Design an enzyme around this catalytic site. Sequence first.
Site, short mmCIF file in Angstrom:
data_model
loop_
_atom_site.label_atom_id
_atom_site.label_comp_id
_atom_site.label_asym_id
_atom_site.label_seq_id
_atom_site.Cartn_x
_atom_site.Cartn_y
_atom_site.Cartn_z
N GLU A 138 43.62 47.07 34.00
CA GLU A 138 42.36 46.41 33.68
C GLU A 138 41.16 47.30 33.93
OE1 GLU A 138 39.71 42.79 35.77
OE2 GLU A 138 41.90 42.61 35.72
N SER A 152 35.30 36.27 35.97
CA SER A 152 35.57 35.09 36.80
C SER A 152 35.18 35.37 38.25
CB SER A 152 37.06 34.71 36.72
OG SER A 152 37.50 34.60 35.36
N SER A 169 34.61 42.60 40.43
CA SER A 169 35.21 43.86 40.86
C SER A 169 34.13 44.94 40.88
CB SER A 169 36.35 44.30 39.93
OG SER A 169 37.50 43.48 40.08
N1 LIG Z 1 31.70 31.14 26.15
C1 LIG Z 1 31.95 31.29 27.46
N2 LIG Z 1 32.93 30.55 28.02
C2 LIG Z 1 33.19 30.70 29.32
N3 LIG Z 1 32.58 31.51 30.21
C3 LIG Z 1 31.61 32.22 29.62
C4 LIG Z 1 31.24 32.18 28.29
N4 LIG Z 1 30.20 33.06 28.04
C5 LIG Z 1 29.96 33.60 29.21
N5 LIG Z 1 30.77 33.14 30.21
C6 LIG Z 1 30.74 33.62 31.59
O1 LIG Z 1 31.55 34.78 31.66
C7 LIG Z 1 32.53 34.65 32.71
C8 LIG Z 1 33.81 35.33 32.29
O2 LIG Z 1 33.55 36.72 32.03
P1 LIG Z 1 34.67 37.74 31.64
O3 LIG Z 1 34.08 39.13 31.84
O4 LIG Z 1 35.13 37.49 30.23
O5 LIG Z 1 35.80 37.46 32.71
P2 LIG Z 1 37.35 37.42 32.57
O6 LIG Z 1 37.85 38.76 32.15
O7 LIG Z 1 37.79 36.29 31.63
N6 LIG Z 1 37.87 37.08 34.10
P3 LIG Z 1 38.61 38.26 35.06
O8 LIG Z 1 40.15 38.03 35.01
O9 LIG Z 1 38.15 38.04 36.49
O10 LIG Z 1 38.28 39.75 34.70
C9 LIG Z 1 32.65 33.15 32.96
O11 LIG Z 1 32.97 32.94 34.33
C10 LIG Z 1 31.23 32.65 32.66
O12 LIG Z 1 30.37 32.78 33.79
O1 LIG Z 2 38.48 41.57 45.37
C1 LIG Z 2 38.45 40.49 45.87
C2 LIG Z 2 38.31 39.17 45.08
C3 LIG Z 2 38.69 39.44 43.63
C4 LIG Z 2 37.68 39.53 42.68
C5 LIG Z 2 38.01 39.78 41.35
C6 LIG Z 2 39.34 39.96 40.98
C7 LIG Z 2 39.69 40.24 39.50
C8 LIG Z 2 40.80 41.24 39.17
C9 LIG Z 2 41.01 39.75 38.91
C10 LIG Z 2 40.36 39.88 41.94
C11 LIG Z 2 40.03 39.63 43.27
N1 LIG Z 2 38.58 40.37 47.31
C12 LIG Z 2 38.72 41.52 48.13
C13 LIG Z 2 37.77 41.50 49.32
N2 LIG Z 2 37.69 40.14 49.96
C14 LIG Z 2 37.45 40.02 51.37
C15 LIG Z 2 37.56 38.78 52.00
C16 LIG Z 2 37.31 38.77 53.40
C17 LIG Z 2 37.01 40.01 53.99
CL1 LIG Z 2 36.71 40.12 55.72
N3 LIG Z 2 36.95 41.12 53.32
N4 LIG Z 2 37.17 41.12 52.01
C18 LIG Z 2 37.49 39.02 49.01
C19 LIG Z 2 38.55 39.10 47.92
MG LIG Z 3 37.79 40.60 33.00
#
Ligand SMILES: Nc1ncnc2c1ncn2[C@@H]1O[C@H](COP(=O)(O)OP(=O)(O)NP(=O)(O)O)[C@@H](O)[C@H]1O
Ligand SMILES: O=C(Cc1ccc(C2CC2)cc1)N1CCN(c2ccc(Cl)nn2)CC1
Ligand SMILES: [Mg+2]
Lengths: 352, 352
Positions: free
Chosen positions: A121, A175, A178
């Site tokens: 990713e 969501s 990162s």
């Molecule tokens: N049409 C839409 N539907 C849903 N969410 C949307 C939309 N447009 C914007 N968003 C926002 O964009 C976010 C998702 O962004 P995105 O970069 O596509 O994440 P993702 O890749 O699906 N999740 P991740 O697995 O964490 O990388 C959602 O949490 C909303 O805050």
């Molecule tokens: O990255 C993450 C969360 C996360 C975010 C995005 C994704 C995307 C790839 C799907 C995955 C995971 N975390 C690591 C550090 N976290 C903590 C928590 C307590 C302490 Cl003391 N320190 N660090 C919080 C969790």
């Molecule tokens: Mg994403």
Amino acid sequence: SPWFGMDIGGTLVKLSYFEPIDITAEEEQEEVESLKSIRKYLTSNVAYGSTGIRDVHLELKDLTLFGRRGNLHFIRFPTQDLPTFIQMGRDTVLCATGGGAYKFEKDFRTIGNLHLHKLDELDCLVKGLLYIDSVSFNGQAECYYFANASEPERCQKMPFNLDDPYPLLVVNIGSGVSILAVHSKDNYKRVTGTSLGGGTFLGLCSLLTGCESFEEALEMASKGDSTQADKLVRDIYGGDYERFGLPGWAVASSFGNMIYKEKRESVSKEDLARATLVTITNNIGSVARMCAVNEKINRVVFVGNFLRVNTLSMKLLAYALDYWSKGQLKALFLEHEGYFGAVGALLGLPNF
Amino acid sequence: SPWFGMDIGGTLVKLSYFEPIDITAEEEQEEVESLKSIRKYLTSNVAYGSTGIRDVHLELKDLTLFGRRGNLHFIRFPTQDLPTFIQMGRDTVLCATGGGAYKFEKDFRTIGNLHLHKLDELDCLVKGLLYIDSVSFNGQAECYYFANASEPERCQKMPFNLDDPYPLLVVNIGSGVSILAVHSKDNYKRVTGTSLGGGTFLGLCSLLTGCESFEEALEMASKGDSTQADKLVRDIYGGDYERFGLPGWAVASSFGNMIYKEKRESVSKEDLARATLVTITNNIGSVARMCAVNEKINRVVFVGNFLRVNTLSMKLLAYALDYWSKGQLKALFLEHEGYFGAVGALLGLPNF
Ligand SMILES: Nc1ncnc2c1ncn2[C@@H]1O[C@H](COP(=O)(O)OP(=O)(O)NP(=O)(O)O)[C@@H](O)[C@H]1O
Ligand SMILES: O=C(Cc1ccc(C2CC2)cc1)N1CCN(c2ccc(Cl)nn2)CC1
Ligand SMILES: [Mg+2]
Ligand SMILES: Nc1ncnc2c1ncn2[C@@H]1O[C@H](COP(=O)(O)OP(=O)(O)NP(=O)(O)O)[C@@H](O)[C@H]1O
Ligand SMILES: O=C(Cc1ccc(C2CC2)cc1)N1CCN(c2ccc(Cl)nn2)CC1
Ligand SMILES: [Mg+2]
């Protein structure tokens, strides 16, 4: 086989599609009808089913890719609807990234003879980001910032040059969040992440206000006053906290005024949407600033779809990063911000 | 004049009161009746009015302070009720700290001839913390940690020695969060803060669940399952995210499952209280970890009243700090955690 790259996230699927426009006469004859149908379906429609959308304004026209000229198209739909995408596909080499490349691997293989190649990713994000910036946005800059973000009468979108783009802090707000430190084209690390991201905004907003879409949440937030829900420094001190340079307007406790029943009873749903947006955005900015200082990087670029059609959060990030860093960090933004993973997946195609 | 120290916060007022127990025969005669009444009122009651509470278990007995032996008492009440405190006081040198020392300065001066001396909220915290640890908790350690916090069958509270307490990262979780780096008894800085603190927990909980007290919020949270509201790494990937060492159980998006209407309709108020607590606590731990790494400090002590009668958050902080730092940081806790500012204010008394 059509040339796709796909990023299956926790919330959205992002798809990049390269349409050749140098189709010769002989090549058109040798086209199988199903291949012609998908190219026509994709290029003659901007809405796909009930939830798929082609972001026409992002199209890269007359791009030379893999030795062919074509247009690069950007398409998105909810991950929840991936079953109907796969079902439509059942009645090709697919480079896929994002968590859903693993979660739905077995589902993609229900498509006969389809070859699924999973790619990481964040390798895909880096390669896609660097590529789009390198080819430009149809001659315009892919990267921009908000000049003079401290003063609202002057604050305006301005292009930013990334021709020597290293080092770079990439903040991917999907969501969750990162945070990546990119030192070279082949040297990058995930510094950390936070779980307070776009899904927190949308999930909390839905619980607090009953909104039914991301866009409705942003529309409510634009009409609200977050200080109705938040406790500010001046609510605690009566004014600035001079000794540590904290202005009276800074949020001391997000939603902190909601501990009082009378205030919960007078707050509006719009106020709560704005407080949710402000809370999430400031926390992202603060985490980005601490990582920048630890990594010794002054260029912070924010991507992901939390910021699409979301100028409030972009300006909040621009202003906060500049203010709290005393001008040492610049908030940068990219026109193709939700799509770099899908592009990077597409670029992995020659390796198969 | 009675010897008080007072920390007027955004949510709670904390009061430290030194009761002399070496009152000689002549001194008792020279006592003005009003002074005798307040000492009797304070020592013969453990609840004051409807909202004041003396934390009897924290009392420091037979302490020598300012050359006199006495008992140090710890008392708290909501800042919202400070008017009734001042009104009771109208029908003394007061060292006061916290934002309310400034906000309510004019109110305190409605008490005739009262001299109010304002002291900085974080100088008082540092001096109070170092003092209480130096005199011990009636011979027991003031500081403790959770040994073997990775394994629940072994995880247990154990004393921790702070006799050479520097350097130290102090994380003050009140309405918001202040993070301090303490390098010596006279060398400390506020590194940063976050607005996602105790007031966010209580305010969001009240909005989401309708709870009417901090304790009820914690009681709901103890019965809930935060994974009903939160989107985990395994919800996105189908399992661990191996490449970056993210376990499937880690939260990828706090409240991120609440974007789906069907899940909002099945989540319980207890689930939402637990997700609020987990979200706030993890974010505090993450911010504390980044600051520790930037400041080059491996001892992180958490104070403030967000953690009183809140073992869930303490264990979450102990486990998370150890896990995410790969064992490089230790989460430390203090028995008098909400009161160090009030103690430090009291210690400023000889300067007036
Ligand atoms: N049409 C839409 N539907 C849903 N969410 C949307 C939309 N447009 C914007 N968003 C926002 O964009 C976010 C998702 O962004 P995105 O970069 O596509 O994440 P993702 O890749 O699906 N999740 P991740 O697995 O964490 O990388 C959602 O949490 C909303 O805050
Ligand atoms: O990255 C993450 C969360 C996360 C975010 C995005 C994704 C995307 C790839 C799907 C995955 C995971 N975390 C690591 C550090 N976290 C903590 C928590 C307590 C302490 Cl003391 N320190 N660090 C919080 C969790
Ligand atoms: Mg994403
Ligand atoms: N009885 C209580 N009433 C209210 N909040 C409580 C209570 N017990 C614990 N808390 C928690 O403790 C927090 C307040 O902690 P505290 O350290 O006293 O902050 P404060 O000094 O009043 N605020 P600040 O101005 O930011 O330093 C609240 O936000 C709650 O999360
Ligand atoms: O300290 C704080 C908040 C706060 C907390 C507690 C108190 C207690 C004393 C009453 C006051 C204030 N903040 C500074 C850093 N913040 C940001 C925001 C965006 C970016 Cl980009 N960076 N940093 C957030 C605000
Ligand atoms: Mg306080």
